[PDB]
Design a protein around this ligand. Sequence first.
Ligand code: DS5
Length: 250
Amino acid sequence: LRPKLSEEQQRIIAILLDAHHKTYDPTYSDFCQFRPPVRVNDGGGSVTLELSQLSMLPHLADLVSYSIQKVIGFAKMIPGFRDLTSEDQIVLLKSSAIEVIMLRSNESFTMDDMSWTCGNQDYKYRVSDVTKAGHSLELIEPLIKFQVGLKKLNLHEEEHVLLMAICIVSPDRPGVQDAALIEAIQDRLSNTLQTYIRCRHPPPLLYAKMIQKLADLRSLNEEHSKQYRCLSFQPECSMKLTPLVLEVFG
Ligand SMILES: CCC(CC)(c1ccc(C#CC(O)(C(F)(F)F)C(F)(F)F)c(C)c1)c1ccc(OC[C@@H](O)CCC(=O)O)c(C)c1
């Protein structure tokens, strides 16, 4: 059966598309405002050298910090998100931050050369840039696999925005107080997505594949958190970060 999207479900999609258009700049025009990228000679991928220099850390921390601000803006526009307590909204934003960043980064990701192409050569990011910021192969390898897997689903913008919204409004995050209300908001979004796929996505199992991506995001989040913790042990690391990044990941 293919039930049609309700007036409410069509309204939810319009709100989320509008929210994304207002919080995502596909021209990457603010990137010149970040601390500049610096790429040291590191053909060997030396952990000692990367930790001593952390050459890409100020630029990558400014990029993630900027993206978190956009994610906070997007979340405020999710139907029902404002119905949650400020404590729950913050727990949800903090626990989902890195996952939503990985999802939204997919728009700039290109399978042409396996990079995140955000304008000129200075804003073209590869595996080596993330290692130059103190991260390791245990994070970057599955991150690239995830980006390809997601790119290959060829999501409609409607599906991409619904997926980010479902990711954020997750009742299974440590520290949430009103899990039942969060689940009700997520179910309203999940039902919109399942209905949309059946009614608007042409052939040639997409909903199941999108849910699997949300599970992959949990493992990437756990690895990112372990690696951030290591990176934070580097003397003088905090100046290379931002207050928002320090709060979200600290
Ligand atoms: C996910 C892939 C990548 C690859 C370079 C990325 C970057 C930085 C980090 C980090 C880190 C930190 O641990 C911390 F703490 F910051 F998390 C560190 F800094 F400490 F190292 C990681 C793990 C991955 C990336 C590429 C394009 C991006 O935005 C493109 C547009 O999406 C922007 C516009 C928008 O989003 O509106 C974004 C956001 C991120």
